[PDB]
């Protein structure tokens, strides 16, 4: 039935006079797929939506929200497109030169070089990494700290009742905000940014976002056993739990 739904979009996109209904329905369809984490499904739909839809449509409470929801959804997708690239890279680290104990004088020199070339690649694989870390992070904070009212949260409050959508928007927050936090923690930990890891407890507990309400009690503790792990590595470095110099 996947196709039935992703195909009803091209029918609504064809007629430009129904772009407001095409987007709204595109949202709904992408709300079902997100709850299943079908990101190639959600995105295959996301491209069918002409890149210039938003511009033309220009506002009923149903169109202000669907424009916001669409960008929220793009903010979410882009937060998985850049992580899978980053993650793919983290798993392609240059491998150490192989050792040939009891080497011939030939094998000694081939190895002096293979050992010197590797000490060039590992520097760039931290180079490319840093730039894929700086980018995946930004996206994770665009979703977690979504501007003007939080992620998947309507700004317009005068639409007509849509319990399906509304409760789909509360759910999407409880499936994906705990899951984006845990990823960002995994990104920060993987790159050794431990001080910042611990600063996820400010972001989450914050009264500005009230992200902690989107967490189950279990997920919290789990995030608290994740942070205590970053803390350790900060002690091993000689700093206090939170990364500040011990005077």
């Amino acid at each position: 039935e996947d196709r039935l739904k992703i195909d009803v979009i091209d029918w609504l996109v064809f007629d430009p006079a129904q772009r407001a209904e095409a987007l709204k329905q595109g949202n709904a369809i992408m709300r079902k797929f997100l709850a299943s984490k079908k990101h190639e499904a959600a995105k295959e739909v996301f491209v069918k939506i002409p890149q210039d839809s938003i511009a033309e449509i220009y506002l009923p409470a149903e169109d202000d929200n669907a424009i916001r929801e669409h960008l929220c959804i793009r903010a979410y997708l882009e937060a998985h497109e850049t992580f899978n690239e980053w993650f793919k890279h983290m798993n392609s680290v240059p491998q150490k030169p192989a050792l040939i104990p009891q080497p011939t004088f030939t094998e000694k020199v081939a190895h002096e070089h293979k050992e010197k070339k590797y000490e060039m690649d590992f520097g760039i694989w931290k180079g490319h990494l840093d730039a894929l870390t700086a980018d995946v992070k930004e996206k994770m904070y665009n979703v977690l700290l979504f501007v003007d009212g939080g992620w998947m949260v309507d700004v317009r409050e005068d639409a007509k009742e849509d319990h399906e959508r509304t409760h789909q928007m509360v759910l999407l927050r409880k499936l994906c905000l705990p899951m984006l936090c845990f990823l960002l923690h995994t990104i920060l930990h993987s790159t050794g940014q431990y001080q910042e890891c611990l600063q996820l407890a400010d972001m989450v507990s914050s009264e500005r976002h009230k992200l902690y309400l989107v967490f189950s009690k279990e997920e919290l503790r789990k995030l608290l056993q994740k942070l205590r792990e970053s803390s350790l590595m900060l002690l091993d470095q000689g700093l206090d739990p939170l990364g500040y110099e011990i005077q």
Binding site: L198, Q199, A201, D202, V204, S205, S206, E207, Y212, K217, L220, R221, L223, L224, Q225, L227, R228, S231, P241, L242, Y244, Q247
Partner: protein, 115 residues
């Protein structure tokens, strides 16, 4: 213990050495959340040297308490007495970005200022 701090199974001796301010750590580990909340708030209060750190500790304390098993009544007290702390802090927090480059102040590496 004072000869371990000055300097695996070293984390079992870390489990015992985490007795004192490192408390909250072995408290999250022991699943003693309520306890972790009390000391996390206590370390937040004495905190005067670093603002960014006084802010982090409360956030942790709060996430500890929320994740713990207080009755909805007690919880409502911890988060209200807390809401106060966050209320004072928010003040130093919203300090304009014009005078903080004027006064040549460190962004985070500054102290817990008083009223």
């Amino acid at each position: 213990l004072f000869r371990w701090y000055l300097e695996q199974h070293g984390q079992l001796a870390n489990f015992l050495q985490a007795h004192e301010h490192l408390s909250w750590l072995h408290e999250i580990n022991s699943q003693e959340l309520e306890k972790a909340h009390a000391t996390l708030l206590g370390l937040a209060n004495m905190e005067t040297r670093y603002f960014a750190k006084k802010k982090t500790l409360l956030g942790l304390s709060k996430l500890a308490a929320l994740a713990s098993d207080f009755s909805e009544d007690m919880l409502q007290e911890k988060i209200e007495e807390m809401a106060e702390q966050e209320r004072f802090l928010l003040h130093q927090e919203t300090l304009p970005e014009q005078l903080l480059a004027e006064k040549q102040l460190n962004l985070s590496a500054m102290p817990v200022l008083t009223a």
